[PDB]
Amino acid sequence: KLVPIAPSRGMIFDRNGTPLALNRTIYQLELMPEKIENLSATLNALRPIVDLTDDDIANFEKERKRSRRFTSIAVKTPLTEVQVARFAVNQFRFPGIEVKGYQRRFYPYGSALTHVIGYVSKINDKDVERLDKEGILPNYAATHDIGKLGIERYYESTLHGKTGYEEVEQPPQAGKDIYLTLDLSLQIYIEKLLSGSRAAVVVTDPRTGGILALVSNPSYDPNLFVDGISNKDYQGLLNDTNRPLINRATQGVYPPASTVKPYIAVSALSAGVITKNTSLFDPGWWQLPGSEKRYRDWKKWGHGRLNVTKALEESADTFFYQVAYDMGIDRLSSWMSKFGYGEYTGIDLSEERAGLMPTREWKQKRHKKPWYQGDTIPVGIGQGYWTATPIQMAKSLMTLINDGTVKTPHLLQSTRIDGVLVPYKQEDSTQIGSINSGYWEIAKDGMYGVANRPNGTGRKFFEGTPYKAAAKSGTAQVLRDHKLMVAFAPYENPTVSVAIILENGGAGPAVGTITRQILDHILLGD
Template sequence: MKKKRDKIRDHSAETHLFLRRALIAFLGVIVLIVILLITLTHLQITRYSYYSTRSNENRIKVIPIPPNRGIIYDRNGIPLAINNTVYQLEIIPDRIKNLNEQLAELKTIVDLTDEEIDNFQKERRNYPASSSVPLKYKLTEKQIARFVVNQYRFPFISIAGKQHRYYPYATTLTHVLGYVSKINDRDKARLIEERKIKDYIGTSNIGKLGIERYYEDILHGIPGYQEVEVDSRSRIVRQLDESPPKVGEDIYLTIDLKLQQYIERLLAGKRAAVVAINPNNGEVLAMVSSPSYDPNLFVDGISAKEYNALLSDPDKPLFNRTIQGTYPPASTVKPFIAIAALSEGVITTDTVFNDNGYWQLPNTDKRYRDWLRWGHGRVDVTRSLESSVDTFYYRVAYDLGIDRLSKWMTQFGFGERTGIDISSTEENRAIMPNREWKQQRYKQAWLQGDTIPVGIGQGYWTATPLQMAKALTILINDGQTKTPHLLMNTRSTHFGEGLSLNDLPQTMSPLLLSVKEKYWDVAKNGMFKVLYGSQGTARRIFANMPYRAAGKSGTAQVYGLKMDEVYNAKNIPEHLRDHALFIAFAPYDKPNIAISVVIENGGSGSSNGGAVARRILDFYELGDASIQIDESILKMRQGD
């Protein structure tokens, strides 16, 4: 039986099958080897650069080093904006699988809040993949200690020291300095458009307002980098290379901090604005908007509660009254109108008008009242300024007409931005009305009656405190324009020789160039008599001054009085009371300071506005407000 089965088995066929299978297996191995060789060639030769880079990206990390932001100083070298080192918690979200769980655990360890987590989730969109994203700012020593003890539980979370912008004088200079805050989507889009985005790698803040925004390119600096080798948990093993950053430029402002602080104290509790300028070169010595707010709240991102509190504050602390507040300039413009009227031949230095308490628009029953109901009698141009005679300027405005009036006032800077080194988007042009403006704004023709209130700085006319101060410097300099500016110079490090605005070319329009010298003197003399003349509207406030000055008051109506209505502040809601305005310069013969004062709903310009102006001039010229002013005078209504 066995032999029979052996005869059936075909050894030759089996051998042939084995050899065929062995050949197929061998060919398979050859094919696999060829595939392996091709793959190795592709990986090691053809795609070497690509995979080498990918490998190095995992092993070698380039850490951007943000530059230190330049320091901002006042004119005397007092630091106004500095950098402090603070410690913040940073996280690499792309490396953490259980991110939400770790964030929840950090709530108890470092007092992480839900608002901070929400801000982190929004902020991480602005960072490249696998980059560290700030999670919590300004850690306390206690929070740092608790995290260090538990750090082994959070491999991709670390503590880092960062430079933090700090404003040591808080509310005092907010509306001058502005502030830095987080780079948002609009900032990022602008930086990309301007091809500056590479300079902000590793930087989370950017200048948002004021000086911080206007001189951002100078203050920011140029980033550096650090090339390091890291392990699988992104911990630094060793440093391979480093390129240090170039620090931002330090800048010196024209601001006098002591004067700024003194004015801020004077305006405490008021809605007001003061601008002080050196008329010789346009340096802004002080620029105070009251009330103000603490810019430090915005550096790391203000909370919704704090921001809503600022927005809902009826006194509007976020509003920069010096360049955004627009007010009827009132009688402060009478010296400028007098120059226009004299130059146009509408009046002469000998012209005399009789004031019986009102001026009547020709061919109508419309009467425009003087602030002194029984009138001032016979008035020439000097007396019109000394006693601020409204009727004189009603008639002058009527004779000049809105075309010439608007043309001249534009030369003094009204209705135009001043050119100050703050973003033009922050500065209001205000309104110097004319025919075209009214047609465009109201689709109505200009009427004769529209011109009359413009003659006393009312009607459609509005101006900012900075515009009023600039106009005053033009008058002081007999028509020459000194552009207001805040930058005095920079401390040169890597931007070349540094920058200064004191050497800006000064301009003078052909129209103002045509003004006779004696007309400038008439206007200044009239302003001098406002303070020292027997009928001067501010003579009591400026009595017993050890130096000579000049000024002009203004009282701006917030709403129009009826024909026979008598103004009585006690019977009027506070927000409808008159604004108090005052412009002044000193010393009279050789001015070194020109100021404009606006106190919202402050009442009389001559007494209340004049009292603030007097104290400021005393402080600047004498070193303090050494001469006391009788407070009972402040309660009097002295007219304009």
């Protein structure tokens, strides 16, 4: 005959070389109930040999009715080699009962990497038709599991390798091995700090775009989906009010609020709607000209005299209401698109929403209405129809740090192709405005102020800092208000950028506190 050989799945490692997705061999005891008589007696006989439980027989008896009749049914899963050996010596005693060996994926950190690594799951009747259409079902002839989430799904083609055939040999080519940019230790640390909180955190290296940590809380056990997830437990996750199936980092859609002020600053400067010198007096409110409609600042009696730099430090709203009015939605929108708002970040994950960067054209298409001046003003403080993902908020900061030199956030560090490591190569080569505009530095300076200067909104969190951190807080609403912060350190030569958001305030610890702990942990070597 000419039956097929399963190719072993490529491994996934972090920066260090720590295995994150392994191929383990799983043994189980099987039998075709047709070839067995006194089944109940035979099951009783196996109790002492492989430690067969009443739960093992229950799952068996029930799974035999659901399963097509006259077929080998798992008697006990899994078996330890101890239990396998204990049976092997009694093979003679039990004919029509044998030990089958299967290659299964194993995630040895589970909850820690659920959303980033994802999982492989049992190929069901829908997945077989999917693979037929594409015309590579032949290559999955022997493969029981497929990637359905995160890296496992995104990098399936790479991880799967070439199927083998044997006339009874053409050996199979193993899947190529994946080295990620992710730091396993940092990921666990962040998750520790985030315990109790429904939150998202992206840590990136602004020089590469490589993601050092990507955390959505709460998580789930990726293992369940490997062992063909139980419909009962699946609906248990779908009904959890903390929706842990959502990748908040990439699918969490939030008003970016405070955090957009630096990117609007650069945009207003670059359009000449303001300059370093441009000044304005804030009584604590701003009037839409001609109307009586007053938009308030967070400070009731205002920040007084404001330029960009003071307005960033103190997160003044009045300043940016004015900027938004003068810019107008058309080119305020166009500028924020250049920073990636409304757009897919290009991250190597399939689970991603694009949020909304509002537009005239969008409001006519969507709501069949024109754009009112009152719609432009809240966009000024990132609270309009404006929604963004943490990964988008992470990508725009990296673009600011790199002076409009856009870097694609990504988890792939390198692939082992024929024993050699070929590294990730960024396709994107986009440049925003001019590299030496100086406007970038004005914005970054303002963020230096938020952290370090005595009028900064988050000076309290960055006291006693050997390094100089630049940061920018935000507060969004919908139940409580979401708490945002983006930050980057060493200020002189940034080596780490952070995006963090705690849904509805989080679980107590301040986002600024957690950003400090994370920045210390990385730069001080804990």
